[PDB]
Symmetry: D3
Subunit: 165 residues, 6 copies
């Protein structure tokens, strides 16, 4: 049935390198085929982690665009739930702004570790993310590591997405 | 019981660990009940938190201190740089899975250091805050310190509101 | 038996007629009808879009509470809002007692949503059944030509 | 801290040890799922509902909240729980409690007991704006089968269909 | 040019209403649809936009009209056109049992075209129901309570 | 070097001065600056609250696209929106039209019932005369916009 990968379920590891916490997520080859393939083909992807300021129970990284073509809207949400792993296509203009306050095409790879989140901000309104993976192992530990990023900072911390094989 | 204020009053807002203070004009004329409730009870000091949904926000949480809560007064759901806000909450509002902190009335005293903020969450929808002060000196320095809380954490950091005199 | 109200711009001399929604907004309909006429300075909405309204002191023995509410008012809607002094006397607004906002929606694609508190539902208590086009034109003229010396008056239709 | 960690762990075991469950059943289609009552985070609402079970009434599919079915019953608690563990973004498996009046839905107090069977839902309508629900249970068995039944309510209708909340043995 | 009208029909229930095609304010969408009528497919009741029924058909215009006369607050009697892709619709969040067009009828009020997939979903308002709205609304409530099995929504030239 | 624009209501004779945000909105700032002056019939906002604006045919060789956007504009913001005739020639209220807007108060939402959120490019911030401009905008709200013209020009 699946558009691209038609074998047994594939999985990605999602790792905070400094804290050394990893969880594992099912790749949604069925309902997000283009986003899943774009990410999978490009793994590993690893960069400075950030805690969300508006989308709530969220951590994410920012990487240069990697796919030959961006997937476009696919399996989108503006109400991400615990365990969602999301992909966003942004431009420099979207992110390099006073409202963001950080210290080409950019991809945001995000993990939602809690509930009651809205992908909505005062820059543009709604910001839907492609849901392309779902955490199936280690979610509680990841959530605890993310609360520690919120309270204890993201200095020298790196979020890495890799193939679990 | 008008509790008239004929001259400008100011509060200092200080991050103790980082050692950064800014000064705010108290909005005695447009937020008289809130301004009094806060003024009369200063200093108020507690662990700082960075917002997860309201964006460019830091705040602390203290036990109710006023003889009676001010109610809605000079409210915003679009807080701006320099806004200092007061929120009345109950334990049920805050002690939630969606908040993920590490019946009683609790006051949130918040500082908005940047723009493009929405006081909206996935617990209840809009969460209006009473705007009761506006930062008139040291906003840039405070904004820099708050980005350092976002990136460097809030461990052992304390937000303190005090009378300037 | 259906009851109707007249809604009039005194200076422009434009009136329309509305059916009072006694069936689905009985408490609001009664509160208003019993107190008519109600007349005051007109204002054009700055956030709710195709709206004019007035502001009057509370008139009912007790406020109706939420009833037949909308945050998506449509052309022809007549709405009632209960506010306090704190709601209206703000910098955001640029104009401890209870105030009633009586509102006419003359066009579509309106949201009763503002940056002070978020959603502001109105009780929909009447629907304009005659002279909506003319009223709409007069409201556009309030938008472009101002509200100076203009009064919005609600009255019982005979 | 080690103290906090251990406390959390202890608290979780306690609530596991006294876990109670409710059955949620569509009577005509004959489909039941089981939900854990959230005595830890929604103690007031969980009690108010447990105490009054069973509760059973005509089912409705939501028209604004999306992947939702619900019933409406007269108020049953001696006092309403008030806002507790609320969401405006309900998720698959959530079971929600709302207090309404006759004016909200058409002066009587009515309870809306709701099951969310899919995702990407917003508890927001054109009458009042946001309508938060108290999340008081989470479906732990039969969610897929319940979701398939709810889709069939959506396409096939709610006629003669009853939604029943009951205590699980 | 003279007013053109369309009939909107539920084939199983046998209920038809008539709408004025909005050639003046939605000319591209009005043309796209008129030229391609009849359009007829399985009916669905909305799950998020409230008092809505609709069908889904393959794209039929030589080119899509694009945003025209849009609303996210549709009102009773609105007929709306949306352009979607299979990605917008074939989702877990939709739970249904390429360019696709959604032709929608709004039979009641207090509707928001807003969902948890993408946020706001504006529709092009291209017709307004002028006869039979009350009967259609009653049929649509009956789709809600009684289901959509073997029911077909048909748009045709009047 | 900082560049400044004057924003003037011609009939009321009220002018304020705005810093052009060449750092954070370079494309929009250049597009506007290179086309000044721009001057047209003033309107008060009906949805974005504490707002006046004008509408002018597109002037730039190419539209800036999204840049430094807000849906929560604040006092002193000057915003740029690119619209088509379809966006604006509606009952609710193709050629490319630009809306140049001044926000004179707070608690504004750039959100409407036509399309939802309508982000504006923030390209200048009023640094002098805001109080006077706000009083004049309140007078447009109460006293109308007839024969009133909003003019954006280079400060000498």
């Amino acid at each position: 049935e699946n558009l691209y990968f038609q074998g047994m379920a594939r999985y990605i590891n999602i790792t905070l390198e400094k804290r050394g916490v990893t969880c594992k997520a099912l790749l949604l080859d069925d309902v997000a085929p283009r986003t899943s393939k774009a990410v999978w083909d490009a793994l590993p992807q690893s960069s400075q982690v950030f805690h969300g300021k508006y989308a709530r129970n969220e951590i994410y990284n920012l990487v240069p665009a990697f796919a030959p073509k961006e997937p476009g809207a696919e399996n989108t949400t503006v109400t991400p739930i615990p365990g969602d792993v999301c992909y966003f296509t942004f431009t420099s203009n979207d992110l390099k702004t006073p409202s963001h306050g950080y210290e080409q095409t950019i991809v945001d790879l995000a993990v939602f570790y809690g509930r009651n989140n809205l992908l909505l901000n005062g820059d543009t309104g709604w910001v839907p993310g492609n849901v392309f993976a779902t955490i199936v192992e280690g979610l509680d530990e990841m959530a605890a590591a993310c609360q520690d990023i919120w309270m204890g900072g993201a200095r020298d911390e790196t979020l890495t997405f890799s193939r679990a094989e």
